Design an enzyme around this catalytic site. Structure first.
Site, short mmCIF file in Angstrom:
data_model
loop_
_atom_site.label_atom_id
_atom_site.label_comp_id
_atom_site.label_asym_id
_atom_site.label_seq_id
_atom_site.Cartn_x
_atom_site.Cartn_y
_atom_site.Cartn_z
N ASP A 43 0.90 -1.40 -0.21
CA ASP A 43 0.09 -0.33 0.08
C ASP A 43 0.88 1.83 -0.16
OD1 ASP A 43 -2.82 1.25 0.39
OD2 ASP A 43 -1.67 2.20 2.14
N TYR A 48 3.07 9.91 0.40
CA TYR A 48 3.78 9.59 1.61
C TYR A 48 5.46 9.98 0.61
CZ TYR A 48 0.03 6.83 2.44
OH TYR A 48 -1.97 6.12 2.48
N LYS A 77 -2.76 5.85 -4.93
CA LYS A 77 -3.53 7.06 -4.46
C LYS A 77 -3.48 7.95 -5.17
CE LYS A 77 -3.72 4.67 -0.10
NZ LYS A 77 -2.52 4.36 0.76
N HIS A 110 -7.27 9.44 -2.87
CA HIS A 110 -6.82 8.84 -1.86
C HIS A 110 -7.83 9.57 -0.64
CE1 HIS A 110 -3.15 8.59 0.82
NE2 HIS A 110 -4.45 8.64 1.34
N1 LIG Z 1 -6.32 6.25 2.92
C1 LIG Z 1 -5.60 6.19 3.97
O1 LIG Z 1 -6.29 8.03 3.92
C2 LIG Z 1 -4.77 6.17 4.41
C3 LIG Z 1 -4.46 6.74 5.54
C4 LIG Z 1 -3.49 6.01 7.12
C5 LIG Z 1 -2.59 4.55 6.96
N2 LIG Z 1 -3.08 4.40 5.59
C6 LIG Z 1 -2.26 3.29 4.67
O2 LIG Z 1 -2.38 2.10 6.30
C7 LIG Z 1 -0.60 2.04 6.90
C8 LIG Z 1 -1.11 1.36 7.66
O3 LIG Z 1 -1.44 2.64 8.78
P1 LIG Z 1 -0.81 3.34 9.40
O4 LIG Z 1 0.66 3.94 8.32
O5 LIG Z 1 -1.35 4.58 10.45
O6 LIG Z 1 -0.62 2.55 11.11
P2 LIG Z 1 -0.13 1.04 11.68
O7 LIG Z 1 -0.34 -0.04 10.91
O8 LIG Z 1 -2.27 0.86 12.33
O9 LIG Z 1 0.51 1.60 13.56
C9 LIG Z 1 2.04 1.76 12.44
C10 LIG Z 1 2.22 1.55 14.45
O10 LIG Z 1 3.08 0.73 14.79
C11 LIG Z 1 3.99 -0.10 14.99
N3 LIG Z 1 3.88 -1.48 14.62
C12 LIG Z 1 3.99 -2.19 13.53
N4 LIG Z 1 4.18 -3.55 13.52
C13 LIG Z 1 4.29 -3.32 14.85
C14 LIG Z 1 4.19 -4.50 15.92
N5 LIG Z 1 4.60 -5.98 15.85
N6 LIG Z 1 3.98 -4.45 17.03
C15 LIG Z 1 4.34 -3.38 18.18
N7 LIG Z 1 4.55 -2.08 17.69
C16 LIG Z 1 4.53 -2.31 15.98
C17 LIG Z 1 4.35 0.58 14.02
O11 LIG Z 1 6.15 0.70 14.48
P3 LIG Z 1 7.47 0.93 12.73
O12 LIG Z 1 7.22 1.07 11.66
O13 LIG Z 1 8.29 1.52 13.50
O14 LIG Z 1 8.25 -0.79 13.58
C18 LIG Z 1 4.52 1.89 13.37
O15 LIG Z 1 4.36 3.39 14.59
C19 LIG Z 1 -0.58 2.74 6.31
O16 LIG Z 1 1.59 3.31 6.22
C20 LIG Z 1 -1.12 3.10 4.80
O17 LIG Z 1 -0.54 2.01 3.56
C21 LIG Z 1 -3.81 4.82 4.98
O1 LIG Z 2 -3.60 10.48 4.45
C1 LIG Z 2 -2.72 9.52 4.03
O2 LIG Z 2 -3.14 8.62 4.31
C2 LIG Z 2 -2.12 9.64 5.70
N1 LIG Z 2 -2.29 11.19 6.02
C3 LIG Z 2 -1.50 11.64 6.26
C4 LIG Z 2 -1.71 13.40 6.88
C5 LIG Z 2 -3.13 13.41 7.87
O3 LIG Z 2 -2.46 14.77 7.45
N2 LIG Z 2 -3.96 12.39 7.30
C6 LIG Z 2 -5.09 12.97 8.07
C7 LIG Z 2 -5.99 13.80 7.10
N3 LIG Z 2 -7.26 13.60 6.87
C8 LIG Z 2 -7.84 13.81 6.08
C9 LIG Z 2 -9.01 14.59 6.02
C10 LIG Z 2 -9.41 14.72 4.61
CL1 LIG Z 2 -11.13 15.83 4.10
C11 LIG Z 2 -8.80 14.44 3.81
C12 LIG Z 2 -7.39 14.75 3.81
C13 LIG Z 2 -6.55 13.93 4.88
S1 LIG Z 2 -5.30 13.63 5.31
C14 LIG Z 2 -3.46 11.57 7.28
O4 LIG Z 2 -4.36 10.23 6.91
#
Ligand SMILES: NC(=O)c1ccc[n+]([C@@H]2O[C@H](COP(=O)([O-])OP(=O)(O)OC[C@H]3O[C@@H](n4cnc5c(N)ncnc54)[C@H](OP(=O)(O)O)[C@@H]3O)[C@@H](O)[C@H]2O)c1
Ligand SMILES: O=C(O)Cn1ccc(=O)n(Cc2nc3cc(Cl)ccc3s2)c1=O
Length: 315
Positions: A43, A48, A77, A110
């Site tokens: 992903d 990013y 995205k 996104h």
């Molecule tokens: N569509 C969008 O708007 C959107 C928004 C947010 C996220 N996403 C995607 O979703 C992915 C996952 O969400 P996220 O990055 O917000 O966070 P997450 O995967 O919920 O949490 C990541 C955090 O957890 C830690 N971690 C990972 N595995 C662990 C384990 N086994 N034990 C303890 N800690 C652990 C990581 O540390 P380290 O990396 O330091 O090991 C990092 O600080 C993103 O990276 C992105 O690809 C998409």
């Molecule tokens: O977007 C990513 O995948 C990760 N990420 C990075 C920075 C950040 O502030 N956000 C929070 C956001 N909230 C909205 C809410 C709305 Cl309506 C639009 C865009 C965003 S971005 C975030 O989710």
């Protein structure tokens, strides 16, 4: 079963690697390790600002003969400042160039919100409000549809869309491709039962992001709830001789969701993939669903005035 069928006839791996906040200094190694221990789904996002380093890693392992392109499922995205129809192809091609690929398996809008075009990823006024662009969801979708018709992406979908925004697209007059996926925040403090119910009923696969509650999110406050540190969840994990994270990854898997936990730590990358050797019981699932608090890690309030801000609606 390790893959879920999309509406384009392709199969998507239910467990992938998150890359938000993975530094370019470390994400290349992350991806290489991930592929070595079995991840096939990565992903990504242009916002990013590490897609080149992700592409470095993919290229490498293709060259080492560890994997073939066909076996990989690469997601990216479209960022909010590119929602104008004349900007979508370019944004997609920049991501393809950075990732050194010829196609993406899945390309997502996104966020439903369009932002003022420019170099700035979060354009603000003098006041701190994000500056919207005059784009709408349907025209942006049509632009996404052209990417399929041109061979640049195999599938298109959306992210952070509420059920009414998903509906707009479905009822789109002249719709060419239905969305394949809606990627949304999902974890035991935000269980998303209603939106998951809607999407799955429309044959749209849901991807859960921030499944570990994104403890590395840059706006964390110490008082915030912490999923990995929740003793109730630690107890469920100790019962299964698994880690809290493994439990948090396995949970969405048993709700027919895709899940994309992020790590750049090689030990944790491996650990997080070892969730196919156990099952949460019915009580475990019920218990975890009961921790719902409707608590969002990702909801930048500087966007709450955008016409298309997604989270004013119940779901
Ligand atoms: N569509 C969008 O708007 C959107 C928004 C947010 C996220 N996403 C995607 O979703 C992915 C996952 O969400 P996220 O990055 O917000 O966070 P997450 O995967 O919920 O949490 C990541 C955090 O957890 C830690 N971690 C990972 N595995 C662990 C384990 N086994 N034990 C303890 N800690 C652990 C990581 O540390 P380290 O990396 O330091 O090991 C990092 O600080 C993103 O990276 C992105 O690809 C998409
Ligand atoms: O977007 C990513 O995948 C990760 N990420 C990075 C920075 C950040 O502030 N956000 C929070 C956001 N909230 C909205 C809410 C709305 Cl309506 C639009 C865009 C965003 S971005 C975030 O989710």
């Amino acid at each position: 079963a390790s893959r879920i069928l999309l509406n384009n006839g392709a199969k998507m791996p239910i467990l992938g690697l998150g890359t938000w906040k993975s530094p370019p200094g470390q994400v290349t190694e992350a991806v290489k390790v991930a592929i070595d221990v079995g991840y096939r789904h990565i992903d990504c996002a242009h916002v990013y600002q590490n897609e080149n380093e992700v592409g470095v890693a993919i290229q490498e392992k293709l060259r080492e003969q560890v994997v073939k392109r066909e076996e990989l499922f690469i997601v990216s995205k479209l960022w909010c400042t590119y929602h104008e129809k004349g900007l979508v192809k370019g944004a997609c091609q920049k991501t393809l160039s950075d990732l050194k690929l010829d196609y993406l398996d899945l390309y997502l809008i996104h966020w439903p919100t369009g932002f003022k075009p420019g170099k700035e990823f979060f354009p603000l006024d003098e006041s701190g409000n994000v500056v919207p662009s005059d784009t709408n969801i349907l025209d942006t979708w049509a632009a996404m549809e052209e990417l399929v018709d041109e061979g640049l992406v195999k599938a298109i979908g959306i992210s952070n869309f509420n059920h009414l925004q998903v509906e707009m697209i479905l009822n789109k007059p002249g719709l060419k491709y239905k969305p394949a996926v809606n990627q949304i925040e999902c974890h035991p403090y935000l269980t998303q039962e209603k939106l998951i119910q809607y999407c799955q009923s429309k044959g749209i696969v849901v991807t859960a992001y921030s499944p570990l509650g994104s403890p590395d999110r840059p706006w964390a406050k110490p008082e915030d709830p912490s999923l990995l540190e929740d003793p109730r969840i630690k107890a469920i994990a100790a019962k299964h001789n698994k880690t809290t994270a493994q439990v948090l990854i396995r949970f969405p898997m048993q709700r027919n969701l895709v899940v994309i936990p992020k790590s750049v730590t090689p030990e944790r990358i491996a650990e997080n993939f070892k969730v196919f050797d156990f099952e949460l019981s019915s009580q475990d699932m019920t218990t975890l669903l009961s921790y719902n608090r409707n608590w969002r890690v990702c909801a930048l309030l500087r966007c709450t005035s955008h016409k298309d801000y997604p989270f004013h609606e119940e779901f």
